[PDB]
Amino acid sequence: LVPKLTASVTDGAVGVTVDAPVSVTAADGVLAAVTMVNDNGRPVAGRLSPDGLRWSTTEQLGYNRRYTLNATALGLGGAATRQLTFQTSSPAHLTMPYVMPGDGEVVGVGEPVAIRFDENIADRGAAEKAIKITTNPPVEGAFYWLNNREVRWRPEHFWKPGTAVDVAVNTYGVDLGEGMFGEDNVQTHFTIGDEVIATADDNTKILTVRVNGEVVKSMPTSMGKDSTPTANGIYIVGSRYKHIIMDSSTYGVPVNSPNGYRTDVDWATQISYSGVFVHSAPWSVGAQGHTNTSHGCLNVSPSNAQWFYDHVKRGDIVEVVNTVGGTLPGIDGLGDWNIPWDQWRAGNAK
Numbered sequence: 001l002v003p004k005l006t007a008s009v010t011d012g013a014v015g016v017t018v019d020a021p022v023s024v025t026a027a028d029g030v031l032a033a034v035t036m037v038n039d040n041g042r043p044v045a046g047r048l049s050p051d052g053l054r055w056s057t058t059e060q061l062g063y064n065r066r067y068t069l070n071a072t073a074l075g076l077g078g079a080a081t082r083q084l085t086f087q088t089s090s091p092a093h094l095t096m097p098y099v100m101p102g103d104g105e106v107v108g109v110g111e112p113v114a115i116r117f118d119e120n121i122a123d124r125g126a127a128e129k130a131i132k133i134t135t136n137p138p139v140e141g142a143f144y145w146l147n148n149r150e151v152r153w154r155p156e157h158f159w160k161p162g163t164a165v166d167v168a169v170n171t172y173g174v175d176l177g178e179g180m181f182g183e184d185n186v187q188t189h190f191t192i193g194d195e196v197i198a199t200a201d202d203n204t205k206i207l208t209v210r211v212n213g214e215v216v217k218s219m220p221t222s223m224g225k226d227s228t229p230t231a232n233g234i235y236i237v238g239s240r241y242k243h244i245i246m247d248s249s250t251y252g253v254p255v256n257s258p259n260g261y262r263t264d265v266d267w268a269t270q271i272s273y274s275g276v277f278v279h280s281a282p283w284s285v286g287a288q289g290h291t292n293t294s295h296g297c298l299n300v301s302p303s304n305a306q307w308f309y310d311h312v313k314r315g316d317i318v319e320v321v322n323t324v325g326g327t328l329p330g331i332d333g334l335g336d337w338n339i340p341w342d343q344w345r346a347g348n349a350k
């Protein structure tokens with residue numbers, strides 16, 4: 001019985017993807033020698049199994065490299081040697097993924113998994129296939145693309161507090177379309193904290209904060225005036241600022257135009273990419289609880305805005321109801337829950 005060799009690559013292959021290790025296996029014998037070098041002669045790190053049967057690379061293989069693999073097997077039957085050479089994928093472009101929320105964070109019940117690429121993704125299905133989301137307790141979720149670069153994953157309903165979420169973006173070696181390959185892999189983990197839902201009801205002009213179902217704060221508010229109203233819908237809480245300059249040019253609106261503005265405010269909590277915040281508004285305290293005066297943001301008192309800053313976290317929820325506005329776009333960036341579940345579940349990988 002002459003020993004046989006079985007490699008995970010074929011001699012002469014090209015376009016070999018680097019998303020998996022390269023292996024050599026011996027049958028009816030054992031591996032006496034296995035080496036693999038790149039085109040600069042640099043040895044590739046590997047490991048031989050204690051039983052001598054299975055050898056495998058132990059470091060990532062490179063893009064745009066030619067590798068030469070030599071292997072010898074020995075056995076009572078005799079010996080066998082093979083030499084194999086192959087070339088790995090040569091990307092036309094690289095894209096790097098960025099994942100939110102941050103590793104180890106505790107977030108609110110409305111926080112989606114977010115995978116943002118720094119380039120347009122031509123094969124959204126390949127990107128989705130490369131992303132593994134683990135949930136404990138397990139829950140059904142689905143992917144939906146907000147734009148050509150960023151995909152989101154969430155359940156049908158708000159997360160259950162206490163849920164562990166693990167995200168593995170294994171895009172290295174993956175053809176994401178049109179010669180674009182993943183620049184690296186990413187791996188993050190987060191946990192769902194307490195349920196915090198704040199409701200701004202235009203009929204009362206009160207922003208009511210509920211923690212685990214209990215009213216803990218009631219904030220008089222002034223929202224957008226009729227000509228620049230606050231959109232109804234579900235908003236996800238994002239970033240927090242002790243102070244920030246609100247500049248309309250950020251959104252293509254010249255500061256000196258009718259709806260333009262440039263002002264510094266305190267205690268600002270972001271709730272939409274379109275620039276809606278909860279923030280301190282000393283100048284509208286008389287209107288708070290009575291009339292809408294803003295350009296769309298939720299004006300509250302300095303003390304209530306700081307309380308909001310101190311007690312609300314990324315992924316908590318603000319829901320606005322009964323304004324004269326429309327509904328916040330589902331693809332805003334923090335408007336994901338406004339997409340109906342059936343549409344989100346069906347996705348848009350194309």
Ligand SMILES: *Sc1cc(Cl)c(Cl)cc1C(=O)NCCO
Pocket residue numbers: 246261262263265274275276277279294295296297
């Ligand atoms: S959030 C905000 C704060 C202030 Cl002080 C002004 Cl003048 C405008 C805005 C704003 O409208 N941002 C855009 C979202 O409507």
